[PDB]
Amino acid sequence: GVEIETISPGDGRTFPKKGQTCVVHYTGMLQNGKKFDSSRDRNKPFKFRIGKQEVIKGFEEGAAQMSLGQRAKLTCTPDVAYGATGHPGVIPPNATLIFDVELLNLE
Ligand SMILES: CO[C@H]1C[C@@H]2CC[C@@H](C)[C@@](O)(O2)C(=O)C(=O)N2CCCC[C@H]2C(=O)O[C@H]([C@H](C)C[C@@H]2CC[C@@H](O)[C@H](OC)C2)CC(=O)[C@H](C)/C=C(\C)[C@@H](O)[C@@H](OC)C(=O)[C@H](C)C[C@H](C)/C=C/C=C/C=C/1C
């Protein structure tokens, strides 16, 4: 599943609600591998709708349990990421992914 290790605490009370749009900054990295993406490196926050299955389960489940302003390291096992299939040319099969995520705003 997804494990959370807080980097910076949030307000501890404002969590993503159904339908809301999460505004996040993230950096993705293969466990014991290379970084493959960074919204911070291109200075451009990433947005996605909660509960609309727009992003892998682990990323959404991680964000869903974070409060406004919180930043955390998410460790996602393959079953809540890209599984046995992986992501063509970027994420190999059975890859555990590490995501440094910061919940910047809720829209
Ligand atoms: C160049 O950058 C890519 C993102 C890259 C691709 C490669 C991966 C390593 C990665 O580097 O992101 C990455 O770090 C990553 O794994 N991410 C992105 C951050 C959130 C977590 C994860 C993810 O779920 O990606 C996503 C993963 C790859 C695919 C999804 C996984 C969950 C599953 O339920 C979905 O349906 C099967 C598909 C990519 C996204 O976050 C983008 C935003 C979303 C989608 C494509 C789908 O939700 C789609 O559904 C039709 C939509 O509703 C969108 C809005 C429609 C419009 C036209 C498409 C825009 C495409 C934008 C693509 C972007 C910015």
XYZ file of C-alpha atoms and ligand atoms in Angstrom:
172
model
C 0.000 0.000 0.000
C 1.106 3.566 0.674
C 3.174 4.554 3.701
C 3.549 8.168 4.813
C 6.530 9.819 6.518
C 5.876 13.485 7.208
C 8.425 16.001 5.953
C 6.561 19.085 7.186
C 3.274 18.965 9.127
C 0.027 20.350 7.747
C -2.632 22.193 9.729
C -3.810 18.754 10.842
C -7.484 19.370 10.128
C -8.036 20.456 6.525
C -8.052 17.311 4.373
C -9.056 16.843 0.712
C -12.835 16.513 0.346
C -14.697 14.621 -2.383
C -14.622 16.483 -5.688
C -11.995 18.987 -4.553
C -8.933 19.659 -6.677
C -5.616 19.041 -4.955
C -2.797 21.439 -5.790
C 0.481 19.676 -5.123
C 4.202 19.809 -5.783
C 5.892 16.438 -6.183
C 9.087 14.611 -7.076
C 8.870 10.976 -8.127
C 11.653 8.459 -7.742
C 12.079 4.707 -8.178
C 12.911 3.025 -4.866
C 16.706 2.697 -4.892
C 16.560 4.141 -8.407
C 16.535 7.460 -10.250
C 14.150 10.398 -9.969
C 11.792 10.298 -12.955
C 9.683 13.423 -12.514
C 9.574 16.687 -10.584
C 6.878 19.356 -10.648
C 9.299 21.432 -8.566
C 12.050 21.285 -11.209
C 9.730 22.852 -13.784
C 8.266 25.223 -11.185
C 4.682 24.185 -11.903
C 2.223 22.804 -9.309
C 0.314 19.652 -10.274
C -3.487 19.477 -9.957
C -5.872 16.517 -9.877
C -9.435 15.757 -8.776
C -9.978 13.607 -5.686
C -11.903 10.397 -6.336
C -11.882 10.695 -10.122
C -9.252 7.998 -10.670
C -6.978 10.449 -12.481
C -3.805 9.342 -10.688
C -2.428 6.042 -9.373
C -4.102 4.834 -6.167
C -1.062 5.281 -3.962
C -0.601 8.930 -4.890
C -4.264 9.769 -4.318
C -4.543 7.752 -1.100
C -1.441 9.504 0.171
C -2.790 12.966 -0.600
C -6.207 12.096 0.806
C -4.705 11.522 4.263
C -2.635 14.719 4.267
C -3.798 18.058 5.678
C -3.385 21.485 4.059
C 0.265 22.526 3.875
C 1.547 19.070 4.771
C 4.543 17.629 2.932
C 5.401 13.964 3.107
C 7.381 11.125 1.605
C 5.039 8.540 0.088
C 6.231 4.998 -0.477
C 3.926 3.200 -2.896
C 4.104 -0.541 -3.542
C 3.492 -1.733 -7.143
C -0.131 -2.746 -6.485
C -1.015 0.894 -5.734
C 1.201 2.254 -8.526
C 1.826 0.689 -11.960
C 1.795 -2.975 -10.932
C 3.219 -5.792 -13.045
C 2.693 -3.737 -16.193
C 4.722 -0.702 -15.161
C 4.494 2.547 -17.149
C 5.794 2.277 -20.758
C 9.401 3.432 -20.965
C 9.505 5.092 -17.533
C 8.404 2.775 -14.706
C 9.363 -0.925 -14.904
C 7.181 -3.849 -13.761
C 6.821 -4.337 -9.977
C 8.272 -0.954 -9.114
C 7.877 0.520 -5.649
C 7.681 4.298 -6.067
C 8.745 7.133 -3.792
C 6.890 10.451 -4.027
C 7.820 13.611 -2.089
C 4.435 15.363 -2.025
C 3.394 18.767 -0.669
C -0.324 19.620 -0.421
C -0.208 23.303 -1.327
C -3.872 24.142 -1.769
C -7.376 22.738 -2.197
C -9.652 24.101 -4.930
C 4.098 14.513 -19.047
O 3.649 14.341 -17.735
C 2.500 13.548 -17.539
C 2.630 12.870 -16.164
C 3.859 11.992 -15.963
C 3.751 10.699 -16.827
C 4.742 9.591 -16.428
C 4.685 9.356 -14.898
C 5.701 8.233 -14.496
C 4.891 10.735 -14.117
O 6.221 11.232 -14.352
O 3.929 11.679 -14.587
C 4.655 10.638 -12.589
O 5.454 11.195 -11.821
C 3.547 9.929 -12.044
O 3.658 8.689 -11.915
N 2.381 10.523 -11.664
C 2.049 11.962 -11.942
C 1.671 12.612 -10.633
C 0.473 11.897 -10.000
C 0.818 10.412 -9.802
C 1.281 9.690 -11.079
C 0.114 9.415 -12.039
O -0.929 8.909 -11.613
O 0.192 9.735 -13.428
C -0.838 9.521 -14.351
C -0.648 8.079 -14.909
C 0.576 7.974 -15.807
C -1.899 7.605 -15.683
C -3.214 7.404 -14.898
C -3.083 6.413 -13.710
C -4.387 6.198 -12.930
C -5.546 5.746 -13.875
O -6.774 5.761 -13.138
C -5.719 6.687 -15.153
O -6.620 6.087 -16.091
C -6.303 4.856 -16.690
C -4.345 6.936 -15.860
C -0.731 10.699 -15.309
C -1.446 11.939 -14.766
O -1.316 12.302 -13.591
C -2.333 12.690 -15.771
C -2.560 14.151 -15.318
C -3.695 11.978 -15.880
C -4.187 11.164 -16.838
C -3.403 10.778 -18.091
C -5.607 10.531 -16.766
O -6.170 10.766 -15.467
C -6.613 11.092 -17.846
O -7.681 10.182 -17.884
C -8.131 9.816 -19.149
C -7.171 12.500 -17.555
O -8.254 12.657 -16.977
C -6.320 13.687 -18.024
C -6.468 14.874 -17.052
C -6.683 14.100 -19.453
C -5.682 14.945 -20.263
C -6.133 15.047 -21.717
C -4.305 14.280 -20.194
C -3.221 14.894 -19.745
C -1.944 14.191 -19.485
C -1.032 14.717 -18.665
C 0.246 14.007 -18.431
C 1.245 14.423 -17.632
C 1.266 15.729 -16.785
